[PDB]
């Protein structure tokens, strides 16, 4: 086959839905990836991409790549406002924005209830699901954004299980950000249910990717 060519972006910002990282390849069957590089190393929000190289060797030898909306914004988060989750570190035409594949939930009014969504993979293919765990810098950024100091995230699946927790700390300035935001991913097998459970600090999926390989 032919390699996939991204424009302006590495694999990080490309599949994260980073704005200003709009590839035009429209190829759904590439072999390996070729990435134009830049300053926001994909992650327009300072963070670490977990098992990145494991994801690089997954997004390779692809024979199908359907992108669907796993968690529709309009009908998925009633108790939390999907809007408002945008910062100036991820802009879109000089205006604060956010990754078009992830939704940054914050407390609605003054309450952040215990969210719990689940996708059961009606697709006949492996589904790539990405999410993010915000790590604020201050104990006040937590309460102001999530209202719960003792928050936790739990992404669970047949193939994957992990309980997350904020790591509040003043990080060195990067893009005017003293916080961080790690990103994760997993493969949901056909017919398996991936659970999400959080009371704060969950950057929730919006768009996933069904795919085959080889």
């Amino acid at each position, epitope marked *: 086959v032919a390699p996939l060519h991204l424009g302006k972006c590495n694999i990080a910002g490309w599949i994260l839905g980073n704005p200003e990282c709009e590839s035009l390849s429209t190829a759904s069957s590439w072999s390996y990836i070729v990435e134009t590089p830049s300053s926001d190393n994909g992650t327009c929000y300072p963070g670490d991409f977990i098992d990145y190289e494991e994801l690089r060797e997954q997004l390779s030898s692809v024979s199908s790549f359907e992108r669907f909306e796993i968690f529709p914004k309009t009908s998925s988060w009633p108790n939390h406002d999907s809007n408002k989750g945008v910062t*100036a570190a991820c802009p*879109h035409a000089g*205006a604060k924005s956010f990754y078009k594949n992830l939704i940054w939930l914050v407390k609605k009014g003054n309450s952040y209830p215990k969210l719990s969504k689940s996708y059961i993979n009606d697709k006949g293919k492996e589904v790539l699901v990405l999410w993010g765990i915000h790590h604020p810098s201050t104990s006040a950024d937590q309460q102001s954004l999530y209202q719960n100091a003792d928050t936790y995230v739990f992404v669970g699946s047949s193939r994957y299980s992990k309980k997350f927790k904020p790591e509040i700390a003043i990080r060195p300035k990067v893009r005017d950000q003293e916080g961080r935001m790690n990103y994760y991913w997993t493969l949901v097998e056909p017919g398996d249910k991936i659970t999400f459970e959080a009371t704060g600090n969950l950057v929730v999926p919006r768009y996933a990717f069904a795919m085959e390989r080889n």
Partner: antibody
Amino acid sequence: QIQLVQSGPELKKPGETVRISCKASGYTFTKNGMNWVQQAPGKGLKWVGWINTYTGEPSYADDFKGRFAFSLETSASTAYLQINNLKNEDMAAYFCARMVRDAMDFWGQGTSVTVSS
Amino acid sequence: DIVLTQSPASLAVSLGQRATISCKASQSVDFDGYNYLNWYQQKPGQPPKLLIYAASNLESGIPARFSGSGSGTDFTLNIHPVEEEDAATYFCQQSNEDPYTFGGGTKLEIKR
């Protein structure tokens, strides 16, 4: 040399329509948004709206959803602000400004609109 | 809206002194430790000129005597010292929530 030039003044009787222009120069028109602000001397400033020159989706203030629109020309690099119908209100200057850092940096020439028969 | 305010309408500051303008928003125009507060200068017959953004960073090409500070809902604009070309009108504007809102605007007067 970033330039944002706006068409000259306009005098229209109440109830017609206007098509003000904003020409981008000295920078890439895409990758940056266009703000529009209404200035009436003494009465201060009011934020009309904002248009994402890539996605093309507009966002208006509550005082303009209905009679004000934003249209783009991207092949050529021009932004338009259309007003209709013109009550003798909105009697004020209109500036087109650029999005950069959630603020406005290179404001435009200026389009003094007058509404009288 | 997130209405801002004006403090003071006008103030006559002598040359070489410190002119302080401060404007207070009804809501908190902060988020994620970032304040979306901006300051503009508008000389008559000219479009507003960007001075400071977010809310302390000076725009490239603006003199150093301009300086902005604040967090939450209390912000300040500091001119140190004051020149004669600084005779204009200053506005404070937010970007935290739609719609964007401008302040009442402060018109500075030089005395000599």
